[PDB]
Design a binder for this molecule. Structure first.
Ligand code: GDP
Ligand code: GDP
Ligand code: GMP
Lengths: 246, 248
């Protein structure tokens, strides 16, 4: 029902999912001096977070995940639990070991499907009618730890990377409190089950339409590349670049 | 699914508005079918401003009563207006623009706790429950028809701070549903019960009366707790009931 009083929570996070997470923790009655945040520099997605951390005087670091300052920041805070909410770096194992209740990260697929990055794009490229999000404990690798909560999200024929990425955030937030409680209560989760799949760091197909693709493949790709303000899918014709309308 | 080519103007401020925009995008509302009316970029509103700049969403920060504001709405031609912690009265003629009307998020169970400082006043008054009301706007503050209400338990450990933040959190999770009610033309249910209204004014100027019972003092301390603002004062600074007892 309620979080253990004096639970100390460290949020490794970036942007709106993180602002929402700190909001939620405060709503759960976690004291202000029992919240610590690790994040990245203030850019045009992290401005909401930063302003909140300054406004509420929430201790935070922007130091790199592999830096000694980051480890110190965690060590001095002594978290019971760590919540990764769109943090953008590999979190060292020795940092995760600081939280005796362990940790959780939000990943935008049904793990072990769509390990890697750009999951939302690839889901659409492969023509998935269904995807999901996975709140999972973190181990030393990305995308591999035990599942605390997974929920299905249906993929529509009109979805873009853009629409799906934002619905992922919105829907995942619904379950965040239950997840924070699962962590409070020591829920071990379950080992990720099923066949994995993996998709490389960089932008799918370099953003470039393959002319050999079927129309269905092209429609999917166009939508998967739609993500303002980034350029749309590129079609090359007579060795020359053209942005698609979408 | 929200009707295609539905045009949505969000009047709002801070995370609730950023989260609204996020939600509309996730629902399939395209950038050029979203417009934002907000206030200046400040320490609560730079999340929203950053998103507007990054995604090239048209917006205004012109005052609610200004011709500029009106013109931004008229020119966009909203099907619906969503007010997400917008801090000004929106003129009737602006609301008129939206054919499917409007909705506003108020953090009480209306008509109870109209006005401002709802979360603080709920705690002082010893309420055990409060909640939020998503309600159609008319030309007055806090009076229009109810689309959706949800109850929030007020715990003995709750501060204005915790309760302010839980309000936002829990309201955000009902928002998609509310957007669908507006879309589908749900007229809502007019407001019934005793109205209450509370002002801008800091209750008792933040100073603890030692004639109050411990139960009252505790509530007041909790209701005054909102970082980074100063806590309750005793005749000095008193953030917890523990600290009160010590001073006594
Ligand atoms: N068209 C385009 N889309 C992008 C680009 N970078 C990111 N995206 C989209 O934005 C989504 C989120 O990107 P990011 O926040 O970097 O997530 P991560 O790389 O998956 O951890 C990705 O799934 C892509 O769909 C880009 O350079 N071009
Ligand atoms: N202690 C203290 N709390 C404040 C002060 N101003 C605002 N707050 C708290 O912040 C909450 C939200 O303030 P605001 O965003 O202005 O909402 P409003 O109720 O619509 O005016 C209020 O309900 C108060 O609990 C202040 O000067 N001192
Ligand atoms: N979730 C996830 N993130 C990754 C993976 N590989 C690289 N990244 C992150 O993506 C970034 C590349 O822009 C790197 O800094 C990593 O932090 C992966 O397999 N899974």
């Amino acid at each position: 029902m309620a979080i253990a009083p004096n639970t100390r929570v460290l949020v490794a996070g970036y942007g709106l999912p993180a602002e929402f997470c700190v909001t939620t923790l405060i709503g759960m009655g976690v004291e202000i001096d029992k919240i610590a945040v690790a994040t990245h520099r203030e850019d045009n997605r992290n401005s909401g977070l930063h302003s909140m951390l300054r406004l509420r005087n929430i201790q935070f670091t922007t130091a790199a995940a592999n830096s000694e300052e980051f480890y110190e920041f965690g060590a001095n805070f002594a978290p019971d639990m760590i919540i990764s909410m769109h943090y953008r770096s590999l979190i060292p194992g020795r940092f995760l070991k600081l939280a005796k209740k362990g940790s959780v990260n939000l990943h935008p697929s049904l793990l072990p499907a769509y390990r890697g990055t750009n999951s939302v794009a690839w889901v659409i490229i492969n023509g998935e009618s269904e995807t999901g999000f996975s709140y999972h404990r973190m181990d030393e690798n990305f995308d591999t730890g035990a599942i605390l909560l997974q929920e299905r999200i249906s993929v529509e024929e009109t979805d873009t990377a853009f629409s799906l990425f934002h619905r992922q955030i919105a829907r995942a937030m619904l379950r965040l409190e239950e997840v924070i409680l699962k962590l409070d209560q020591g829920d071990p989760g379950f080992a990720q089950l099923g066949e994995a799949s993996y998709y490389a760091r960089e932008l799918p197909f370099g953003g470039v339409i393959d002319p050999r693709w079927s129309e269905v493949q092209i429609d999917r790709f166009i939508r998967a590349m739609f993500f303002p303000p980034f350029p749309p899918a590129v079609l090359k014709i007579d060795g020359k670049v053209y942005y698609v309308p979408s």
